[PDB]
Amino acid sequence: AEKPKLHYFNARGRMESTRWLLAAAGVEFEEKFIKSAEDLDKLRNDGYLMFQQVPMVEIDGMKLVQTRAILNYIASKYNLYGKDIKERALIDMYIEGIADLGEMILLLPVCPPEEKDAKLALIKEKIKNRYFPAFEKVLKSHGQDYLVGNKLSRADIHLVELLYYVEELDSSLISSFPLLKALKTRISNLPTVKKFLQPGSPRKPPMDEKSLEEARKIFRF
């Protein structure tokens, strides 16, 4: 059958959570890297990008854009979206909080230098006093290895991805949250996730100066 194909540039950006979810599901996929503004303009002009943006993923005969549309489809297709409407409500609540915090961190490299220190201080406050307490409370309420329904869901994958990024910012932020530490360890030892964390996978590194320079050239900003 059709192997999913991911269109993005060679960076984490807004495509990385899709790489994580597919890899955790054990799904082999291909990447086609946008390398220039001209490559992106070609995808646009040829009609493959509904809103003239990437990420775009070719899957099951669709040319899907919008990261949440992509992720919702992949999660349902591979049984990572709970078992019923009520479990989906819990999953959706959890992953939208993860997305809110993830978006703050995603945009740090494009923060104006005079605002960066204060932006980071606000993110750390929210991590320590709002988001990490909320997810620690979920894990403590039921004591299970997984956030919802006692089985792996996209919520476990998205949260553990975020925990790795929080660790890159400040490895002390998770220190008072032992259940989050334990989730990070367990999920990382799942065979599919372990393979994704090992070298040679589609997992991408933190954006550096040269990668930011490429992004400015490709996306003209």
Ligand SMILES: N[C@@H](CCC(=O)N[C@@H](CS)C(=O)NCC(=O)O)C(=O)O
């Ligand atoms: N809400 C969209 C945002 C997509 C988006 O902002 N993509 C950027 C790259 S990360 C882009 O293609 N920007 C070019 C532009 O908007 O013209 C999503 O979640 O996919």
